[PDB]
Enzyme design. Structure first.
Site, short mmCIF file in Angstrom:
data_model
loop_
_atom_site.label_atom_id
_atom_site.label_comp_id
_atom_site.label_asym_id
_atom_site.label_seq_id
_atom_site.Cartn_x
_atom_site.Cartn_y
_atom_site.Cartn_z
N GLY A 102 -21.70 -2.78 25.81
CA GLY A 102 -23.34 -2.37 26.07
C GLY A 102 -23.50 -3.07 27.75
O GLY A 102 -24.26 -2.55 28.28
N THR B 133 -27.78 -6.19 16.29
CA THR B 133 -28.81 -5.75 16.89
C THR B 133 -28.85 -6.49 18.35
O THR B 133 -28.33 -7.61 18.53
CB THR B 133 -30.05 -6.25 16.35
OG1 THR B 133 -30.15 -7.58 16.27
CG2 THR B 133 -29.88 -5.77 14.75
N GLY C 65 -17.29 -13.54 19.13
CA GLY C 65 -17.83 -13.33 17.82
C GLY C 65 -17.73 -11.65 17.78
O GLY C 65 -17.61 -10.99 16.75
N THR C 66 -17.76 -10.95 19.03
CA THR C 66 -17.67 -9.64 19.17
C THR C 66 -16.44 -8.77 18.48
O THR C 66 -16.41 -7.76 17.59
CB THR C 66 -17.54 -8.98 20.54
OG1 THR C 66 -17.84 -7.72 20.59
CG2 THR C 66 -16.27 -9.27 21.38
N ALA D 22 -24.13 -5.61 33.27
CA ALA D 22 -25.33 -6.21 33.13
C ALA D 22 -26.45 -5.77 33.67
O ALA D 22 -26.48 -5.90 35.09
CB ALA D 22 -25.11 -7.57 32.61
N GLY D 23 -27.68 -5.44 33.21
CA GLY D 23 -28.98 -5.01 33.69
C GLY D 23 -29.05 -3.72 34.09
O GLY D 23 -30.24 -3.22 34.83
N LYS E 143 -33.04 10.04 17.42
CA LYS E 143 -33.07 8.64 17.11
C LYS E 143 -34.10 8.73 15.63
O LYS E 143 -35.45 8.68 15.88
CB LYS E 143 -33.76 7.74 17.98
CG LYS E 143 -34.13 6.24 17.53
CD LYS E 143 -33.49 5.18 18.38
CE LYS E 143 -33.90 3.98 17.49
NZ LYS E 143 -32.91 2.89 18.07
C1 LIG Z 1 -15.12 -21.69 19.23
C2 LIG Z 1 -16.05 -21.24 17.75
N1 LIG Z 1 -16.70 -22.47 17.33
C3 LIG Z 1 -15.01 -20.98 16.75
C4 LIG Z 1 -14.11 -19.73 17.21
C5 LIG Z 1 -15.01 -18.62 16.99
C6 LIG Z 1 -14.01 -17.24 17.12
C7 LIG Z 1 -14.69 -16.08 17.37
C8 LIG Z 1 -13.77 -14.91 17.57
C9 LIG Z 1 -14.85 -13.49 17.51
O1 LIG Z 1 -14.94 -13.13 16.30
O2 LIG Z 1 -14.96 -13.01 18.49
N2 LIG Z 1 -14.03 -22.13 16.50
C10 LIG Z 1 -14.15 -22.51 15.14
O3 LIG Z 1 -15.05 -22.29 14.34
O4 LIG Z 1 -13.24 -23.40 15.10
#
Ligand SMILES: C[C@H](N)[C@@H](CCCCCC(=O)O)NC(=O)O
Ligand SMILES: Nc1ccn([C@@H]2O[C@H](COP(=O)(O)OP(=O)(O)OP(=O)(O)O)[C@@H](O)[C@H]2O)c(=O)n1
Ligand SMILES: [Mg+2]
EC number: 6.3.3.3
Lengths: 227, 226
Positions: B170, B12, B145-146, B199-200, B38
């Site tokens: 996005g 989200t 995290g992406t 962005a924006g 939608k």
């Molecule tokens: C720097 C963060 N803390 C983490 C690394 C997260 C990787 C995310 C990669 C992704 O899913 O885009 N490092 C770790 O848990 O050792």
């Protein structure tokens, strides 16, 4: 052997380290021996040390790491930026198996969420889990979006027949708003919710964190983890 | 029939609506006819209304919806709070199949991620996409995290033989930053990144938005959609 749990999460920053420490703390007070393993650790140049933090909150002395990269990035990227390589799949499995031991609970915390690359090529904590026959404990948030992320993660676990040992809400706000309260109810319909750790738990001192840890989990579930 | 694309996201707040609008604007500038559906919109009490944004930014007029829940929650939560069911599966799939027509790109914008509940009983955008043979356009962020979230989504897509039409970032930050620069390369190692929207952009008026959108997608790809 003993029991191995991988401690994964719906993403990075969701509370895996604090969950590792709390479950480790609760299992120790039940008289169970605990090792925590962190095979790939990124962001060391920022002082990120998940093993050290487990030791600081839980008093765990059996901390095993393996790969350490300075930048706070995905392991693949942090390794590329350091001029280093990722560990091999079997290097990670070896580190875990050498810790495994009857009566010992061996927690294995990943880097971020379940499908992050830990070893070449595209080896994940899911692959590591299959190799050591481990179950996965999934740390989730209470925030908007957690239902989808959780379901995606569970589905990816079942794709390789890695069993889900339950969910843990890493950070539980007090008081819980409408969205948090609702999500906690819905997550309970997807899987056994094993604990809901109070927000800010990393600021609890040794005794308070140990108190919180024993109350957080069902005693029978913790004891049933290792025979 | 034409081309139905479902527009989902890795989570989200990834900017699905601005991507729908941008893709819409591009396709119209190639002279393609666009519809946006939608099925379910939440958060309406605070004025959430993603179809109006698509109308303003892209000038789409075939804008289709079935339910609006005041609470800013996931739809099934919003439904429960309001005391009313979600729509039925049939309503969604038939509204979409009725929008679909030759020459038209029909975009279907979900709510939240791919597995969130959209209709009774527990049917997802993924089910909907299967029922209408649509591919999925995955909206992603460029943040730490992406990668995990994207791989998770592409895996769920594949598990039900829903094709992946690509990823769009996005919101591309300025300046990028180390994580975002590396992620843009990494995302491209797992799927075709179709665009990265500055962005924006959401805040632009329609004139500038149309220009942004025109330059954001590859023209051959846009045309090749229908
Ligand atoms: C720097 C963060 N803390 C983490 C690394 C997260 C990787 C995310 C990669 C992704 O899913 O885009 N490092 C770790 O848990 O050792
Ligand atoms: N009940 C909780 C849960 C989390 N935190 C804090 O929230 C942040 C994130 O928790 P963490 O365990 O580090 O999340 P991880 O999933 O381990 O993130 P990573 O991928 O970096 O390992 C930390 O500052 C941690 O101290 C806390 O105080 N109390
Ligand atoms: Mg951690």
């Amino acid at each position: 052997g003993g029991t191995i749990l991988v401690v994964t999460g719906t993403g990075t920053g969701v509370g895996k380290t604090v969950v590792c420490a709390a479950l480790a703390s609760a299992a120790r007070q039940a008289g169970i021996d605990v090792a925590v393993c962190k095979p790939v650790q990124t962001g060391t140049a920022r002082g990120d040390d998940d093993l050290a933090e487990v030791g600081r909150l839980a008093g765990v002395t059996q901390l095993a790491g393996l790969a350490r990269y300075p930048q706070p990035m995905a392991p693949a990227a942090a390794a590329e930026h350091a001029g280093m390589a990722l560990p091999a799949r079997d290097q990670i499995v070896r580190l875990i198996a050498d810790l495994d031991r009857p009566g010992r609970l061996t927690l294995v915390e990943g880097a971020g969420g379940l499908l992050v690359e830990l070893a070449e090529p595209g080896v994940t904590l899911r692959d590591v889990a299959v190799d050591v026959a481990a179950a996965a404990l999934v740390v989730v948030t209470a925030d908007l979006g957690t239902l989808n992320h959780t379901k995606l993660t569970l589905e990816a676990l079942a794709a390789q027949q890695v069993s889900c040992a339950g969910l843990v809400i890493g950070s539980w706000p007090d008081p819980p708003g409408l969205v948090a309260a609702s999500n906690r109810s819905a997550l309970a319909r997807i899987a056994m919710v094993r604990a809901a750790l109070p927000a800010g738990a990393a600021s609890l001192d040794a005794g308070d964190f140990a108190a919180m840890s024993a109350a957080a989990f069902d005693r029978n579930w913790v004891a049933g983890l290792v025979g």
